[PDB]
Design an enzyme around this catalytic site. Structure first.
Site, mmCIF file in Angstrom:
data_model
loop_
_atom_site.group_PDB
_atom_site.id
_atom_site.type_symbol
_atom_site.label_atom_id
_atom_site.label_comp_id
_atom_site.label_asym_id
_atom_site.label_seq_id
_atom_site.Cartn_x
_atom_site.Cartn_y
_atom_site.Cartn_z
ATOM 1 N N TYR A 191 0.874 -5.054 -3.438
ATOM 2 C CA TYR A 191 1.690 -4.349 -4.433
ATOM 3 C C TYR A 191 2.755 -5.266 -5.062
ATOM 4 O O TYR A 191 3.326 -4.914 -6.087
ATOM 5 C CB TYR A 191 2.371 -3.104 -3.835
ATOM 6 C CG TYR A 191 1.415 -2.072 -3.266
ATOM 7 C CD1 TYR A 191 0.058 -2.085 -3.579
ATOM 8 C CD2 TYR A 191 1.877 -1.080 -2.407
ATOM 9 C CE1 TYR A 191 -0.820 -1.153 -3.027
ATOM 10 C CE2 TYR A 191 1.007 -0.141 -1.857
ATOM 11 C CZ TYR A 191 -0.340 -0.192 -2.159
ATOM 12 O OH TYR A 191 -1.199 0.734 -1.593
ATOM 13 N N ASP A 248 5.442 3.661 2.585
ATOM 14 C CA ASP A 248 4.123 3.044 2.538
ATOM 15 C C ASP A 248 4.150 1.843 1.598
ATOM 16 O O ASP A 248 4.469 1.992 0.418
ATOM 17 C CB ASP A 248 3.055 4.027 2.070
ATOM 18 C CG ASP A 248 1.674 3.397 2.097
ATOM 19 O OD1 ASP A 248 1.120 3.279 3.213
ATOM 20 O OD2 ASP A 248 1.181 2.969 1.020
ATOM 21 N N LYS A 268 -0.044 -3.216 4.874
ATOM 22 C CA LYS A 268 -1.486 -3.366 4.861
ATOM 23 C C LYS A 268 -1.854 -4.827 4.647
ATOM 24 O O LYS A 268 -1.254 -5.526 3.814
ATOM 25 C CB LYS A 268 -2.130 -2.507 3.762
ATOM 26 C CG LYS A 268 -1.527 -1.103 3.630
ATOM 27 C CD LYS A 268 -2.288 -0.215 2.676
ATOM 28 C CE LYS A 268 -1.525 1.072 2.374
ATOM 29 N NZ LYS A 268 -0.410 0.856 1.414
ATOM 30 N N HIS A 312 -6.399 -2.952 4.664
ATOM 31 C CA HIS A 312 -6.237 -2.232 3.396
ATOM 32 C C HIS A 312 -7.574 -1.690 2.854
ATOM 33 O O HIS A 312 -7.634 -0.554 2.379
ATOM 34 C CB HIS A 312 -5.549 -3.162 2.386
ATOM 35 C CG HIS A 312 -4.873 -2.467 1.254
ATOM 36 N ND1 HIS A 312 -3.753 -2.991 0.650
ATOM 37 C CD2 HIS A 312 -5.173 -1.320 0.595
ATOM 38 C CE1 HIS A 312 -3.391 -2.181 -0.328
ATOM 39 N NE2 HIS A 312 -4.233 -1.162 -0.386
#
Ligand SMILES: NC(=O)c1ccc[n+]([C@@H]2O[C@H](COP(=O)([O-])OP(=O)(O)OC[C@H]3O[C@@H](n4cnc5c(N)ncnc54)[C@H](OP(=O)(O)O)[C@@H]3O)[C@@H](O)[C@H]2O)c1
Ligand SMILES: Nc1ccc(CNC(=O)c2ccc(Cl)cc2OCC(=O)O)c(F)c1
Length: 314
Positions: free
Chosen positions: A49, A44, A78, A111
């Protein structure tokens, strides 16, 4: 229990994956390499990030080494909030593909249901600290996601942090071409999500549980907060089964027909977290864990609470 769950696009998704939020860029390449070596087949990811390049280095090396074939991996990313505009979605997806060194994603998620003003900043703020919204609605963003399927960039599309009315809005979209395959939401014994899970499952949408361990490394942690890993009631269930508390917390969503994505960059824990296919929680264990609900969220953000599409007012 089987290792994969069938999605409404006809593909199978591994029910255990490796989370990567907060995984430092200097550690996440080895984390993902170890994960694949010890059996993980689902990672994931997300652009926000800021570590997709380093995740991708690991994926590519394990493909090159022929530890796994691409068709055996299930890679998720996402679309961040600042890319909800029609003209930005393809580029956002392609940047993620380039960073992950992939030709397609198995699953691409919106997201959050909240669109933000595009630009370099992931959280564009006005001078009083409120996030600056985009006027693009979730339905137009969804149509842009559908185009990615039809261009071969992604095999499945889905949503994340959508409340039941927002899921319903997508399902009722005029001219809907592809249903969401997945809704990825926070879920653990302190936020058990019975209502939203039931709704999604009843519509054939698979639910992925994030922060299943209660995200002890979340940056806004007040040590006042409740701690799943330290809860003596959960520790007791783990002791009874000769497993760790983390293993109980991972097995719990699995037995609710959820996908679960615990994060670690610690090799011993990455392996520990995968060793959850050889014991079973009883129905009594399951109901007992459900009883610990307190509607406590890891993921909420004050700066975004006035956004028209903020999901957690409902
Ligand atoms: N869609 C969204 O909006 C959203 C939001 C939040 C999260 N997510 C996804 O869900 C993933 C998981 O959630 P999360 O990262 O918030 O937190 P989490 O998986 O609940 O917890 C991660 C923390 O638990 C520790 N840990 C992992 N395994 C352990 C074990 N066996 N024993 C003790 N401690 C252990 C990790 O430490 P070490 O890493 O130091 O080992 C890290 O501090 C994320 O990484 C991300 O991929 C998505
Ligand atoms: N609209 C909105 C957006 C984000 C959040 C909470 N998420 C975060 O604050 C967050 C920020 C940066 C990063 Cl890299 C991760 C974050 O949380 C995890 C995630 O959103 O996946 C939220 F509660 C609402």
């Amino acid at each position: 229990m089987a290792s994969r769950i069938l999605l409404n696009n006809g593909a199978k998704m591994p029910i255990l994956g490796l989370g990567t939020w907060k995984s430092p860029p200097g550690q996440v390449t080895e984390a993902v390499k170890v994960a694949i070596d010890v059996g993980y087949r689902h990672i994931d990811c997300a652009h926000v990030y800021q570590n997709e390049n380093e995740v991708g280095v690991a994926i590519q090396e394990k493909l090159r080494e022929q530890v796994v074939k691409r068709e055996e991996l299930f890679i998720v990313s996402k679309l961040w909030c600042t890319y909800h505009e029609k003209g930005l979605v393809k580029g956002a997806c392609q940047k993620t593909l380039s960073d992950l060194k992939l030709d397609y994603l198995d699953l691409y998620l919106i997201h959050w249901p909240t669109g933000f003003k595009p630009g370099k900043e992931f959280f564009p703020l006005d001078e009083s600290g409120n996030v600056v919204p985009s006027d693009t609605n979730i339905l137009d963003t969804w149509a842009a996601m559908e185009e990615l399927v039809d261009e071969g960039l992604v095999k499945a599309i889905g949503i994340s942090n959508f409340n039941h009315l927002q899921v319903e809005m997508i399902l009722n979209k005029p001219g809907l071409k592809y249903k969401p395959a997945v809704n990825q939401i926070e879920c653990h014994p302190y936020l058990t999500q019975e209502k939203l899970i039931q709704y999604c499952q009843s519509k054939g949408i698979v639910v992925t549980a994030y922060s299943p361990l209660g995200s002890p490394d979340r940056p806004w942690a007040k040590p006042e907060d409740p701690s799943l890993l330290e809860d003596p009631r959960i520790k007791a269930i783990a002791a009874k089964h000769n497993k760790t508390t983390a293993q109980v917390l991972i097995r719990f969503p699995m037995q609710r027909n959820l996908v679960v994505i615990p994060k670690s960059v610690t090799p011993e824990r990455i392996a520990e977290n995968f060793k959850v296919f050889d014991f079973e929680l009883s129905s009594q264990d399951m109901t007992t864990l459900l009883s610990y609900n307190r509607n406590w969220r890891v993921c909420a953000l004050l700066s975004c609470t006035s956004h028209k599409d903020y999901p957690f007012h409902e």
